């Protein structure tokens, strides 16, 4: 993640996560030994048990694997999502219009450069995009053009195998959308689960009893079922079939949307932790991936022309990223303001960036000095810590500059 | 309406609409005789049959009735909508806090000045509000405060008696809103019928067959009934009871929303006339009253805090006023552009007002000169007719001024 120099790098065991340590990770770990321009030498100690020792020596003497890219379809695969995405991007973008061009493109891949089957993989990917009509075939050979369902995947950056599920889910929402709360909007922008946390199903079912009626109404629409939650409480649930994989994913996705609903209502991370069991960094790493996904789904609906969906969803990318009520969404345009600092300026009465740009800097200082509880009390992710006087002056001047940029 | 002077005002019959002419109307008619500074005398001829001569004399010699206002509750009335609004509008505004103030306010009323029963009429209106939680009561006498439902009825200028149906309809929509098209929104912003036209029920039922499935899914939600339309086709239908009055109103309101949906999608008035039977001026007078009502429902939902409703509804006031697609809503900010002129500039490629301010005036001239089909070809409601060269120059300079005003 970050370059930190250290003199002594200790690795407590050659085994990580129940696996032997990856040589790439080990060389990244050990490569941080030695404080540049301060140490005479760097030191690393792999602490190793007598039973581990053969693995430990393998880490010291081993060297990185050659690169081999995902465009190789494995045994029993006729297509790969990276290749499908590749063929989509060139057809829908229009830079490869014909099968003669698609072979000419594929010869530029690192797969071709590594081989220097692929001519079959191209055709199999074309066939998948065609049968679902991400692309359409016209007679010249064949000339392939996108549909609206194709062009939307390229603009959204959504994976097209997921796009069939996203597309049908959004249509089924529009057939009957619960505007009564933001939970139905949230559910559609929740990511696929990807094990962002270990769900405590006995907590989740005991929340489901308390869950507001207008949120259980969403749950029945999206497909949650309280008998299956009780079956998760009763014991281990396993999915053998793609039907069962989809059935289970809905409940994990709904639990995620409840965490986000607390997150976009400024519920403190300590209270979310106590209520759902999540760690702070799990909630924040969920928050980033949901905010990214909320962007994709907006552009996807806009390209299709679901104008009433893009109105609702567009607010949520910013609103998820900071995790704020609807009113703070203006203030946060000042990058010095997080949800905490925006709420204290909003609480005082600086409801909008234009009013904040008018503000007397001494008043912003006194608001921050009082509301937050020298010594660089405030942290700004692009800076070292700031004093109240310095942060307030930079806030006002940044708000004015935003007006200057917005008017220009 | 607009003052037109004429030398002879001829009135073809003393009977209008099957009724004797109103003396206020007759004196408004005859008062237009005589072209100021041109005629020596004005003339009016009431043409009258031998059977009507007694009515003719009654109009000719009659004089206007004394004015008498609606705050007099009739026999069998506990309260009047005007008095309920009056008593609300002072309580929710805080200008009359207690019953001592409400009797003091009533003494300022033209009702009191005309009488110079009402002290009971105030209490009956207070009681109707209180029981519905438009307002709430506290121990001092009593001190009355508005609820959110009362403050919404004030701010939106809606009537209090209709608000209970608007409120419960909007709630029932939010329990399950069809975003699949703009019709479910249009059903909520369309006014009550008020005899804006006479429905051709055999025509309407033949449309109800063709009606798109996503527009019949709305219809089942709002409460339209395929059997009741057939019952209107079968023969005359009447309502003896309020439960029957609203049942008929739902179908009249749905028919109105279909006319608006065609208008909202720029279907020409001649094609709407052929399709629905409306006159041009019936659509345009519906259009203006639907654009007023769309504003009220936005403010009502905003005050209650139905933020997801106010997002959807707010666009429709401008769309209804002009009868435009979503993309023209920016261009239309130029008051010289109607839906027709906005469509020809949007077709040429001036999608947004900033590009219209950049446009070369000679290019806008050539676009108007070509796209519309000297002699003041173009009509501007605030002006006499304009030449292509003059209208185009005024459009570009108005677009620039709109930027100057928006930046300032």
Curated annotation (Swiss-Prot), chains A, B:
Subcellular locations according to the entry: Nucleus; Chromosome
Tissue: Highly expressed in testis.
Region: Interaction with RAD51, residue numbers: 374-408
Mod. after translation: Phosphorylated by PLK1; promoting interaction with TOPBP1 and recruitment to DNA damage sites.
Domain of life the protein comes from: Eukaryota
Disease: Breast cancer: A common malignancy originating from breast epithelial tissue. Breast neoplasms can be distinguished by their histologic pattern. Invasive ductal carcinoma is by far the most common type. Breast cancer is etiologically and genetically heterogeneous. Important genetic factors have been indicated by familial occurrence and bilateral involvement. Mutations at more than one locus can be involved in different families or even in the same case.
Entry domain remark: The loop 2 region is involved in the binding of the 2 ends of resected double-strand breaks and homomultimerization.
Chain's role: Low-fidelity DNA polymerase with a helicase activity that promotes microhomology-mediated end-joining (MMEJ), an alternative non-homologous end-joining (NHEJ) machinery required to repair double-strand breaks in DNA during mitosis. MMEJ is an error-prone repair pathway that produces deletions of sequences from the strand being repaired and promotes genomic rearrangements, such as telomere fusions, some of them leading to cellular transformation. MMEJ is required during mitosis to repair persistent double-strand breaks that originate in S-phase.
Self-association state and partner proteins as the record states: Homomultimer; forms homodimers and homotetramers. Interacts with RAD51. Interacts with ORC2 and ORC4. Interacts with RHNO1; interaction takes place during mitosis and promotes POLQ recruitment to DNA damage sites. Interacts (when phosphorylated) with TOPBP1 (via BRCT domains 7 and 8); promoting POLQ recruitment to DNA damage sites.
Family named by the database record: Belongs to the DNA polymerase type-A family.
Protein name: DNA polymerase theta
Organism of provenance: Homo sapiens
Gene (name only): POLQ
